[PDB]
Design a protein around this ligand. Structure first.
Ligand SMILES: O=c1[nH]ccc2c1ccn2Cc1ccccc1
Length: 283
């Protein structure tokens, strides 16, 4: 680590968690395998408050060029903070072992598994509230010109107060990468992204519309009968996800606006917050 550029070391200092500030519980995983090797940890703040965190070791980082790029990603993501976006608590640069990413612990795991869980019974109002929270998190990301590229219910998380956090971006990416011993998002993508492999805030709006559909169906898979290959033709014919049984008509109108074939015709996330907040307030 002494081979690191000193001005970059100075720049990342405010993101770095010293080893005496963090107690990593490498003996216990969070999500019992659902998220791979993500560990419980305890972070000590400056007042000695104990903070429950999720810790991941980044084994793909093997050389000093990759460590330096990682430091930079930490610097950038530390400036992203919003009630509905997963925050970065910090990073660890270890003398012994791969670097660590430290995030806030999410008591209720991912939003898709939460809504699919038969034991949980969120109301239509609660489901719309989750959608509004995601819209607020994306309004924040879009306001900083950050394009998510993989928005879906599986990629959002829930804390102990049931606050939704948009996740799976920056150092929280690769949320479901699992390591196997012997084994080797087209249905959320905007039509133009399927065609050009380019992503924008307007393609995140399309994905948000599919996430809204997931919320109102309590986590049903979209287009279950359509092969991923055939999705482009299906959308070009003007076919779209149908209105879920318990979805209010003005909310389905919002979903349809998200899937307009012309990206410029789709609402902005600011407009989505405006429209969904008014719908939410009728319940
Ligand atoms: O309780 C949690 N809080 C925040 C993130 C998170 C969990 C569980 C899995 N994950 C995903 C992830 C963790 C670390 C690094 C990268 C991705």
């Amino acid at each position: 680590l002494s081979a690191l550029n000193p001005e970059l070391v100075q720049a990342v200092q405010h993101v770095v968690i010293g080893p005496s500030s963090l107690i990593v519980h490498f003996n216990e995983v969070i999500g019992r395998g659902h998220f791979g090797c993500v560990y419980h940890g305890t972070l000590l703040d400056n007042d000695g408050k104990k903070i429950h965190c999720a810790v991941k070791s980044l084994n793909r980082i093997t050389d000093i060029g990759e460590v330096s790029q990682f430091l930079t990603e930490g610097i950038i993501m530390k400036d992203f903070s919003h009630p509905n976006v997963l925050s970065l608590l910090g990073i660890c640069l270890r003398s012994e072992g791969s670097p660590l990413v430290v995030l806030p612990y999410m008591k209720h795991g991912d939003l898709r598994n939460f809504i699919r869980n038969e034991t949980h019974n969120p109301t239509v109002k609660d489901l719309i509230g989750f959608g509004l929270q995601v819209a607020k998190g994306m309004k924040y990301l879009a306001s900083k010109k950050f394009v998510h590229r993989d928005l879906a219910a599986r990629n959002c998380m829930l804390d102990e107060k049931f606050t939704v956090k948009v996740a799976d971006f920056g150092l929280a990416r690769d949320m479901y990468d699992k390591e196997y011993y012997s084994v080797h998002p087209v249905k959320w993508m905007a039509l133009e992204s399927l065609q050009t492999q380019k992503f924008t805030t307007k393609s995140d709006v399309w994905s948000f519309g599919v996430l809204l559909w997931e919320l109102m169906t309590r986590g049903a898979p979209p287009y279950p009968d359509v092969n991923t290959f055939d999705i482009t033709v299906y959308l070009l014919q003007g076919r779209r996800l149908l209105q879920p049984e318990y979805c209010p008509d003005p909310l389905y109108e919002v979903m349809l606006k998200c899937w307009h074939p012309k990206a410029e015709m789709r609402p902005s996330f600011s407009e989505l917050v405006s429209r969904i907040s008014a719908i939410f307030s009728t319940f």
